Amino acid sequence: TRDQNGTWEMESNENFEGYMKALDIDFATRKIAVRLTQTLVIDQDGDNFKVKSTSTFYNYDVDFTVGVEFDEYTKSLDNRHVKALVTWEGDVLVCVQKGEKENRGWKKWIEGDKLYLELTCGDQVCRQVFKKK
Ligand SMILES: *C/C=C(\C)c1ccc(-c2ccc(N(C)C)cc2)s1
């Protein structure tokens, strides 16, 4: 399946530290962030996505259209400008963020009753598994 709608609660988080470090997020933010359960709210209508992740102390909001390039100012994260593009490979959703960092982006897919998120930056791979609320 390609359907990723829902409110998703984090079950496991393998190597989040490794990924955040590759982005140059400040240590103080990293230490707090690795302990926190995330609630991911995905609103997917055709090719239009509105994604909100929230925790006790941090917000992450982004709106995008699949197959349409867009200029991003990553305000709350690392404060950079990137040219972003999101597409499909079989049943895997693939984002490439073109800019300074290499291999920057992510992949999301389903196997059984879980959502896999693979976040990449450089030579690091973070694997997160979520289950539906
Ligand atoms: C496709 C889903 C993506 C890219 C994300 C979901 C949560 C994200 C996130 C949460 C929190 C932080 N910090 C720095 C607290 C960064 C990213 S990205």
Numbering used by the authors: 1 to 133
Extract from the study:
Human cellular retinol binding protein II (hCRBPII) was used as a protein engineering platform to rationally regulate absorptive and emissive properties of a covalently bound fluorogenic dye. We demonstrate the binding of a thio-dapoxyl analog via formation of a protonated imine between an active site lysine residue and the chromophore’s aldehyde. Previously, we showed the utility of human cellular retinol-binding protein II (hCRBPII) mutants as a fluorophoric tag, wherein an active site lysine residue (Q108K) reacts with synthetic aldehydic chromophores, giving rise to the formation of either an imine (Schiff base, SB) or an iminium (protonated SB, PSB). Q108K functions as the active-site lysine and forms a Schiff base with the aldehyde, whereas the K40L mutation is assumed to eliminate interactions between Q108K and Lys40, an interaction that could otherwise impede imine formation, and is also required to promote Schiff base protonation.
Thus, the M8 template (Q108 K:K40L:T51V:T53S) was retained for further protein engineering. We first focused on the Arg58 position, introducing aromatic residues (M9-M12) to the parent tetramutant M8. However, results were disappointing with most mutations resulting in modest hypsochromic wavelength shifts. Additionally, comparison of the M10 and M11 structures shows that introduction of Trp58 results in an almost 90° rotation of the entire chromophore, altering the position and therefore interactions of the imine at the opposite end.
